[PDB]
Every structure is written in C-alpha cells, then in structure tokens.
Amino acid sequence: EWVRKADRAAGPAAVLAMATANPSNFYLQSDFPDFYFRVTRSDHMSDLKEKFKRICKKTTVRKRHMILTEEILNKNPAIADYWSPSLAARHDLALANIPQLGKEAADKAIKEWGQPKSKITHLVFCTSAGVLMPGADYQLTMLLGLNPSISRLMLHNLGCYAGGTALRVAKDLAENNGGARVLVVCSEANLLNFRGPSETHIDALITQSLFADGAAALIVGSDPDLQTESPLYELISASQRILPESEDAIVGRLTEAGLVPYLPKDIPKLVSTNIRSILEDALAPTGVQDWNSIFWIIHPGMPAILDQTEKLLQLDKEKLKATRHVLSEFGNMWSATVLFILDQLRKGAVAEGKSTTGEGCEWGVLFSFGPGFTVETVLLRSVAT
Amino acid sequence: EWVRKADRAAGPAAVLAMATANPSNFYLQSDFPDFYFRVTRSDHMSDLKEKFKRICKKTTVRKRHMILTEEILNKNPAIADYWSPSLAARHDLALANIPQLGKEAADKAIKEWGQPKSKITHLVFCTSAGVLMPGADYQLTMLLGLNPSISRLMLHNLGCYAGGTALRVAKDLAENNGGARVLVVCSEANLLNFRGPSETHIDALITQSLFADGAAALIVGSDPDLQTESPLYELISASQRILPESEDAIVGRLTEAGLVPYLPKDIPKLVSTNIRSILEDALAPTGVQDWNSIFWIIHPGMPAILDQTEKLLQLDKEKLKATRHVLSEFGNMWSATVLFILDQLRKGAVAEGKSTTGEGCEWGVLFSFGPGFTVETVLLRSVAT
Secondary structure, X not given: OEEEOOOOOXXXXXXXXXXXXXXXXXXXXXXXXHHHHHHOOOOOOHHHHHHHHHHHHHOOOOEEEOOOXXXXXXHOHHHHOOOOOOHHHHHHHHHHHHHHHHHHHHHHHHHHHOOOHHHOXXXXXXXXXXXXXXXXXXXXXXHHOOOOOOEEEEEEOOOOOHHHHHHHHHHHHHHOOOOOEEEEEEEEOOOOOOOOOXXXXXXXXXXXXXXXXXXXXXXXXXXXXXXOOOOOEXXXXXXXXXXXXXXXXXXXXXXXXXXXXXXXXXXXXHHHHHHHHHHHHHHOOOOOOOHHHEEEEEOOOOHHHHHHHHHHOOOOOOOOHHHHHHHHHHOEOOXXXXXXXXXXXXXXXXXXXXXXXOOOOOEEEEEEEEOOOEEEEEEEEEOEO | OEEEOOOOOOXXXXXXXXXXXXXXXXXXXXXXXXXXHHHOOOOOOHHHHHXXXXXXXXXXXXXXXXXXXXXXXXXXXXXXXXXXXXXXXXHHHHHHHHHHHHHHHHHHHHHHHOOOHHHOOEEEEEEOOOOOOOOHHHHHHHHHOOOOOOEEXXXXXXXXXXXXXXXXXXXXXXXXXXXXEEEEEEEEOOOOOOOOOOOOOHHHHHHOOOEOOEEEEEEEEOOOOOOOOOOOEXXXXXXXXXXXXXXXXXXXXXXXXXXXXXXXXXXHHHHHHHHHHHHHHHHOOOOOOOHHHEEEEEOOOOHHHHHHHHHHOOOOOOOOHHHHHHHHHHOEOOOHHHHHHHHHHHHHHHHOOOOEOOOOOOEEEEEEEEOOOEEEEEEEEEOEO
C-alpha cells in the first residue's frame, strides 16, 4: 500500500560526504618493536621482543598514527606498564583528544557537504577510547557549535564492529525523519588498550601491533537535494548477527589498568564458516551471482581473515585493494577502519576514473566484526561518477 | 504526498507491554544511615553521619532495592572504601547481575505481550552500572534465547536521561521497519557509584541517598495487530536538548575506583528556567492549553525539582502522584526510573478505573535529564481502557 509521507523521509539513506583524520604523530611498523619495548621499560625480555618482531611483520602494516608519544608516556608511566592503575589518566587523554580528533574529520566532511552545520539534526558518535560523562558526542556538539536540540546517540565500547552499527543506526534516523541530516563520527585511539608487554599475555601483545588512532566522519541523509547535495553511496540494508558457537571469542574487560583483551577462540575459522551464508543473505535482493561483480569493505582486524576470504570465494586480488591499503597505511582503528576503507575506495574509483563510486560495480558489501562474536553487514549501492 | 510502504511501518510507535524488576534485597531509608556508615567502616565521622541523616530524610524515599548486601561488601571491601581500586570487582558484579535483572523485567513484559520471543527483532539496552565487552545487550540475548540476528543497540553510561533516549531510539526503529518489535531494557544499579563517605566530597554522599537498583522492560512496535496486541501508549515525538549555560553541571568521571560524580552548577534552577519552553514546544501539535489536562512523568533525580515544577506551572498535586510513588518506593534507578513511573501510572489508571491509560487525559509528557546538561522529552498519547 501507500502511506502518508507526513514527517518521514521518502527514499533510502545515502552517504552524502565522508572524511578522515589522524593524529600527526605516527610510527612506522619497522621501527615499532624497538620503540615499544623501550618506552615500556621492557628491553630485557629479548625472546618476547623477537616474537613481537615476527608478529609486527605479519601484520602487513606500514605505519600507525598514535596520540601517545614518548613524552606523554613519560609523564604517564602507568600507561606504559603492563598492568598498573591508570584509567583516570587515560580518560584525561581521551577528553583532550577524542572529541577534537572527531572534529577534524567532521570539519572536512562538512566542508565537502557544503551545507550549513545548522542543518545537522542527528549525531551518532562511536568510540572505545574512553567512557566520558558527558560523552564525546556532547563535546563535539560544543566544539562544532551544532544545534543544542540535536538528537545524539553515544555508543561507548561496542568494539571493532561499531562502524557497521553507526551505519545501521544512521540509516533508521535518516529514513524515518524528513530533512534529517545525520553526522556520523567514529573517533578511536589506543588510550585504553595500550600497555606494556607480558610474557604471560600474548593476546594483549598481538593487539599492540595492530590497533591505532583515527577518526572518520560522514553525513548521512535521505531525499538528497541533488542541486546542492551529491550522494556517494546508498545504505540499502544493515543487519547484526551473533555467530553460532562463538561465546567468549572476544572479551574485553575494562579494569583499573584500562582495557584488557582476551581472544581464546579462533576468529578466522568462525568468519570463514559463516562468511558466505551471511553475504549471500545480504545480496539476496540484488540478483548478483558473481562475487567479483560487487565491491568490498572488510574490517581488517585480522589480516589472515582477508586472505582466507579472498581464497574461499575466489576474489580478484584487486577487490580488497582499498581494504589492504588502509590496513597498511593506518592499521586497525576500531570502528573507524571500515569508514576509512569506504573513503579510500571512493577516492580510488574517482582517481582511476571508473563509472561508479563502487569501482564500476553497482552493489557492494560492508562487513565488520567484534565481541559477540558479533557481525555487522551492510549492503551498499554505488552512484554514477 | 504518499510514499510506498515497502518495508517500513505505517503508524506511530506504540508501547505494547511494560514490566519492572528489582533485586530482592532492599534497605529502608530510615535504617540506611546506620547501615551505610557501618559497612563503610566510617562510624567515627559523626558530624557527617548527622548530615547524612538530614539528607536521607529530605529525599522523601522510603526504601531502595540494592544488589550490594553486607556480605557482598564484606568480600569486596574496596567497594566500601571512598576511593580504592575496585573497578574489576564492580564489573564482575555487573556481569553477574545486570543482564539477569534485565531478564526478569523482560520476562514479565514478554508475558504480558503474549507473542513469541522470536518476533522480537530489535533490542535496546541502557545501563550505567557496568561497561561490558560483549555488552549486557548480548548477555540478555543469550539468556532469553532471542534470535541471533536481532538488531541490538548497547547504550553505556549515558546517565539518568537514558530512559528518554531508549524511547527516542525505539521510536525510530519501530516506525521505519515493518513488523519490527523492539525490546527496551534499562537495567541499572549502584555498582559503579557506591562508595564510602568523605567529609571532602559531599556531592558523592548526596548521591548515596538516592541511587538504587532496578530494571524496566518494554515492547515497542508500530502497526499493532489489535486482536493479539494491546497498545498502552503512543510515542508521538521524542527530542533531546542541551540546556543553555549548563557546562559541567553534571560530570561523572569513570576511574579505577568506579564512577565519581561532580555536581557544581545548580540543577533545579536550570530546569525551572527552561522547563516551560521545552514542554510547550513538545505540546505544540496537540492544542492543549491547561497544564493539568495532561499526565506527567518527571525523572525524580532531585525531589526539589518535582516541587518547584509543581509550583511553577501550578499543577494538581495528584499529577505527579505516580512520580513520587516510584521515588518513595524505589529511589533513583537511573534510566529505569521514568519507565517505572510510566508503569505505575498505567497501573494506577487501571486500578482507580479511569477512561485512559493516561489517568483520563489524552496527552502526556515524559521528561528526564542528566549530564550535558541534557534534557530528554517525549510526547505520549494514551489509549482507551
């Protein structure tokens, strides 16, 4: 049937602008083992340093931007310890850095959007870098000077999959509210996860070689005014799922010493078992038969998952090109990573001169994962260039 | 104009079922000063004990349900200290209690609903009692055995206003997804805020006399099947707002010793200045002229705000009856409090035999507040009985 439009939106939610940002300080992966084991006063565990050398090189990561410098770690030595009371000091750094880093990505995205900031009616903010009261959603509202009546959603500590959660949330906000313009900001950092090495906890050490800082920002709206606004993608469907037989696969305890992770169950085998059934369910209303006829955004939380999925569905090596570029150039930035990849994919399609923002393909899938074991899946539709 | 219904819902979001729950252990307010100053090994600060006696009696609170017993505090003495490392112990108690308490409220609400749990497509979970990874939204999904493909939203540490945020979120989920049934669960406790007294920090002591444990649960859906489903209220509008000149009015730092509050600015004066402009804006599409022609749900975070608002708009003393009942019988349960009040208001209207679930009135306003200074406002429409 047909319903009265009233105050709701007509068409599907669309990505209207994107931008990213990182702290200025970065670390090359080739130099990181020496720096890490030095500032964490840990040069004596030489056998662990060799293990970290091997782990860091299999990450296929080149550089990672980080708020934490040697000087900051020197004035907060408990953060460099493997396990010492440091939460309040980490949260002071989060208050001084997380909303500000999110404003840098938001400013660029609003600049590309072209419309006034007073047209932003909703704000979705994801971060696992610090629990703040009021949250970083409020701090960004003040720094940007957004409307005091903005409808905000603060998402604390959902994990690495929250990039898909933010897209899933913004979709419902924009499609159900006429004229709604949703600012999406994922601002992440290692302020809660960074700690010294332990020969006992190799899970925590492995995460020290991938996690990095960064912030992504989007403008999501339905019914775009095509004379002033330019859509980049369409959010057609977004769903969440808990993988079967995956209890306590990823657990992160927030303690007096910050965020401590635990990864007992095998993650790549869990994704490899379910990846096909999930993505086929997402592509069901599209009629796509070739896995290589769509563009891809996979959360590079574990690079081995990129390789095994590339093999299992027999993808062109160029399909995951934007995914591996962000991983190589920026590392794992929690929820911001998949939005970084969506922007790099957009830029690469425009640069190499292809017909669609989705590298010439019409449909695309976004897939991230985290504690649950939770899987977030989004079906995207590209636009002509 | 008219748009194709497609996969969206036709009518506004409706509250289809409600229920509450509390821990079995409770404390009468008349006995609390002796118990508090005894288990926090603090009987020697006699002048502070007298201050607490006076504060506790002005709360107009009778009893408060609490997970923390004397024995539990005895096996976790750092929780009883004013400021000692205790976060991990608090989060162990949150893992063992918060999802379970939310399941008790959810079971009763699903029982009143009558439909199978496999019809629940969305879950919204609010808590400020513990940051968990995976969250209490996942734990409830497992305990209830809800669909693994449920769309979840975990809201950590938004504060006291999150009861209105959950209603604001569920409204968009139900109205934009056809057939969607949204389970809303606010499960709160003092596991992060409870601590010993300090003659230095009187803000923290005042919160020790109001905050309490409890969980509320709703089923929210649009387009109700009126032969099996019975609506109780309608969510017509829900908005968020930051009050002008209110920076750092309520701040809660999450530290190694748990949640420490700071309340420097005057809260009742902030609400009294803005309460009328906000509620008039919410009632604008209703045509209501008498403030006593609508029913009321005000977050009883500060009882002085109930009295000043009652005076300022000259309300019948019976308007805030359900609000003061929950405050007297249960205290401040963070986001669950206003949903407790909505249920008591529903029960009181049915018991005293009135024409509407809103005590005979047609329209009603829900109003909660917290860190920001943030204000959440919801316009409700009652239903015939």
